[PDB]
């Protein structure tokens, strides 16, 4: 479990992300797609995008980035008490979108990379540690729902 001091580090930097949800969302998805090209293939919506400039130009991609970060923000602000928010998400990603747990690991790495680019002074080691712990908790709780439904994998 995160301590109260660790949750404060997470939510302090998240308040900055919320100044520019769309810019953040875009950078994160693009990092994910470039670092792990196999993740782009999950999105019939975005499959057609081949270069980073094309990705950067796509309004639809920027719109989905907002969706992802708004859902994640609502989970983080529940500070671990996220059962009602997490269950729908784990059900669609396991059974409808077919997203392996590993790809949730990849997008966590992307989020940490982008927070680090954009918010150095608010994202030193102690905040990066707290953010990694929060994202592991998210993954751990999702993985348990996957297992229940027969998708641990
Ligand atoms: C931080 C983790 C993530 C969050 C908060 C998140 C959130 C969402 C939300 C809220 C939706 C729309 C509602 C729903 O279908 O559940 C969605 C759809 C989707 N997500 Fe995720 N997602 C995450 C990670 C991923 C990753 C890593 C992949 C793919 C590698 C993925 C693939 C999809 C797909 C394919 C859709 C449907 C897109 C469309 O055709 O409209 N998601 N996600």
From Swiss-Prot:
Transmembrane segments: none annotated. This is Myoglobin. Monomeric. Gene3D superfamilies: 6.10.140.2100, 6.10.140.2110. Keywords: Cytoplasm, Heme, Iron, Metal-binding, Muscle protein, Oxidoreductase, Oxygen transport, Phosphoprotein, Transport. The gene is MB. GO terms for cellular component: extracellular exosome; sarcoplasm. The modification Phosphoserine is found at residue 3. Its EC number is 1.7.-.-, 1.11.1.-. It catalyses: Fe(III)-heme b-[protein] + nitric oxide + H2O = Fe(II)-heme b-[protein] + nitrite + 2 H(+); H2O2 + AH2 = A + 2 H2O. O2 binds at residue 64.
């Amino acid at each position: 479990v995160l301590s109260e001091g660790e949750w404060q580090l997470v939510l302090h930097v998240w308040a900055k992300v919320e100044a520019d949800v769309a810019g953040h969302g875009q950078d994160i998805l693009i990092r994910l797609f470039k670092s792990h090209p196999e993740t782009l293939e999950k999105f019939d919506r975005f499959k057609h995008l081949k270069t980073e400039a094309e990705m950067k130009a796509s309004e639809d991609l920027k719109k989905h980035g907002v969706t992802v970060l708004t859902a994640l923000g609502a989970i983080l602000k529940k500070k671990g008490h996220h059962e009602a928010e997490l269950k729908p998400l784990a059900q669609s990603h396991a059974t409808k979108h077919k997203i392996p747990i590993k790809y949730l690991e990849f997008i966590s790495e992307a989020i940490i990379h982008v927070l680090h680019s954009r918010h150095p002074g608010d994202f030193g080691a102690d905040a990066q540690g707290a953010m990694n712990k929060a994202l592991e908790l998210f993954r751990k709780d999702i993985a348990a729902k996957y297992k229940e439904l027969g998708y641990q994998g």
